[PDB]
Amino acid sequence: ANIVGGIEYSINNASLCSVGFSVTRGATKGFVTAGHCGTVNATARIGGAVVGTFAARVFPGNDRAWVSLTSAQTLLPRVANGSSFVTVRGSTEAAVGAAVCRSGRTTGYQCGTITAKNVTANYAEGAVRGLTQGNACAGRGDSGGSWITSAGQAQGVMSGGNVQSNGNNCGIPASQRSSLFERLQPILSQYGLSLVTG
């Protein structure tokens, strides 16, 4: 499978999440995603085929994971935006006020701005600290997906949000949205990963 940010993958033939970013760890191919999407050694499938397994995760506390892929997978420096693509150029962390977009398999590609950093989300499982908040909307299934600027700087992976009963926060105004992502830079250094760029 071609590994592009934003696309759907399944975890042990049950949950669905979205690919965050293509990364390498020496000769190993992988992608970063949300920690709550699977446990270590959970099997990830893309389009019904086994592509790799969860190698490590931290959730709750943090919300991060990376999936080690088989050598047959094709890593690409890209995040899906409809039928188009955004090229991953690096991982400069944008500041509050900056414009940002996110990609995932439920709401597709949504943009908004960064409103706050170091937010704690109190999930049923435990708190996850240090999240950045944007007001781009998101829905159930978007977890793990890419947050990127139009200039191609990768920001982090979708963690959670104030979802309404329709499964997303796209029908409430931007001013009222809290969509939270886990910062990419600590995930890259914690696991010794390098971003695939183009």
Binding site: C17, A34, H36, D63, A121, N122, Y123, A124, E125, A138, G139, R140, G141, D142, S143, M158, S159, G160, G161, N162, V163, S178, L180
Partner: peptide
């Protein structure tokens, strides 16, 4: 806010 919930995970996703």
């Amino acid at each position: 806010a919930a995970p996703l």
